[PDB]
Design a protein around this ligand. Structure first.
Ligand code: PLM
Ligand code: PLM
Lengths: 271, 271
């Protein structure tokens, strides 16, 4: 029997088809163009570091789909097709926003400090690629930890909360903000795949719980290192804050990131 | 600039999102259950060889997505996410039909003669897997030829036409038939990817046109070998034909297959 209708990832796959119909081509970015045009040069430089982090972050999950297919986990692989399609819309949405406000050509990589690179240039592609040649429990937990629990479950979740804190209130960038709420919803499913994947391996052998915690801790310094750097950039050129009577509470944001991290650790149980 | 909005595979990707919203979970198979229940044991064995061919044919296209991503073909890779998701629905639809009429447990692999295996067990996974380690023009044309032009563009297209010839007229299996029309539409896009991929490589060096033709010809004997075998099985136990005043014109079907083959060769030009 080809499919287990009761399998959690099969149920997550059904959910993905029903809830992941959004199309980035349907979003109206015209107001966003005006909003970015109305900004001052200084203000313009304010918003770009946060948007740089998202525009780099090619289907990172591809190796995972390959490895789980090879192990015969058909339901996981079905679900992963929706994940990879979500990644495609992700890239599409930011590229349309960038083109709509005229920073399509601009090289935002300058807002990737070293800590960012330690995550997005090394730990993530390395941990995913590994799975082509080594699909051990450790390897899989590591790939799920870095991508699902850290990149998505911590940084992405915190960047989405940040965009809303700043701009939903500013009245700015209604197209981006709609894109972000769709991304955020897609990502709920991604995090559940990660949790399901880590938990099933931990269930098998409690030693893998320590490995999960250890690897969340080893990545923490670069997560907080990138947040400080953005934080510092922000504080240092917050003309946008002055202009839009915004309270960019960087101390709040920072605590939101910490809370995401501890919350992810907490969704994996030793038993 | 991340995306070329004018790129053909980007336009094929936009088309895929708009036209590929079908969900196999939304199909009503209740009548199909009744229809299969109403059949005689003999009749029941009539329909299964054609359905065996489709139920085996895990994301076969995965290696292609990996290789084109590695070569920086971002638009191709976006489109391929829709392809792989279509493959997932494909597997899902047949598994739901099989479960709905009670042949979910049954081992249909017995209707795979050797010629079928030469295609679905060897040429296809071998040609796709190759791309992980060898992504030369030849390798890519070969993968596109076997999967898109032969498996989809010849066998699948001909099996869809066959199901309709037999059952749209019988009044049987309205759920399956609706599934089939969705599959057939998804496959139009798959064939266009294959054509676009083969053509772009041929454009570069006309010697690859000969290689395309040579490899279509080398696969032909197993395509026609599998068709004869089904043909022969059919002729040999056509109680379903008698019962439903069907004219299963096997000579027509056979010519339809030949026509698909020659038609695929014809969609690739030397210049
Ligand atoms: C000022 C506080 C800043 C909070 C931290 C911002 C983090 C930027 C996150 C971007 C990285 C995630 C991109 C890929 C996520 C995905 O798979 O969809
Ligand atoms: C009696 C004439 C028979 C005609 C030939 C029938 C061929 C059966 C085809 C099944 C193989 C294709 C399955 C995979 C296609 C896909 O990628 O969606």
């Amino acid at each position: 029997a080809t499919i287990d209708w009761e399998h959690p990832m099969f149920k997550l796959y059904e959910k993905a088809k029903r809830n992941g119909k959004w199309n980035p081509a349907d979003i109206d970015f015209s107001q966003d163009q005006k909003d970015f045009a109305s900004l001052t040069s200084e203000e313009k430089i304010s918003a770009l570091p946060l948007v740089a982090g998202f525009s780099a972050g090619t289907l990172d999950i591809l190796p995972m789909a390959h490895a789980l297919a090879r192990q015969g986990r058909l339901e996981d692989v079905l679900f992963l097709t929706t994940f990879m399609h979500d990644e495609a819309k992700h890239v599409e949405m930011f590229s349309r926003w960038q083109q709509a406000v005229g920073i399509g050509q601009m090289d935002l990589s300058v807002f990737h400090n070293d800590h960012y690179k330690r995550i997005f240039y090394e730990a993530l592609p390395e941990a995913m690629n590994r799975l082509y040649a080594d699909d051990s429990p450790e390897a899989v937990i590591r790939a799920a930890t870095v991508y699902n629990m850290i990149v998505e479950g911590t940084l992405a979740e915190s960047g989405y909360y940040t965009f809303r804190q700043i701009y939903k209130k500013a009245g700015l960038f209604p197209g981006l903000l709609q894109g972000i709420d769709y991304l955020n919803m897609d990502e709920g499913r991604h995090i559940q795949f990660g949790i399901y994947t880590i938990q099933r391996i931990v269930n098998e052998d409690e030693r893998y719980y320590e490995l999960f915690i250890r690897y969340m801790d080893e990545l923490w310094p670069h997560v907080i290192g990138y947040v400080d750097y953005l934080t510092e950039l922000g504080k240092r050129q917050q003309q946008l804050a002055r202009t839009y009577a915004l309270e960019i509470d960087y101390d709040l944001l920072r605590h939101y990131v910490i809370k995401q991290f501890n919350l992810r650790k907490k969704q994996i149980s030793r038993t």
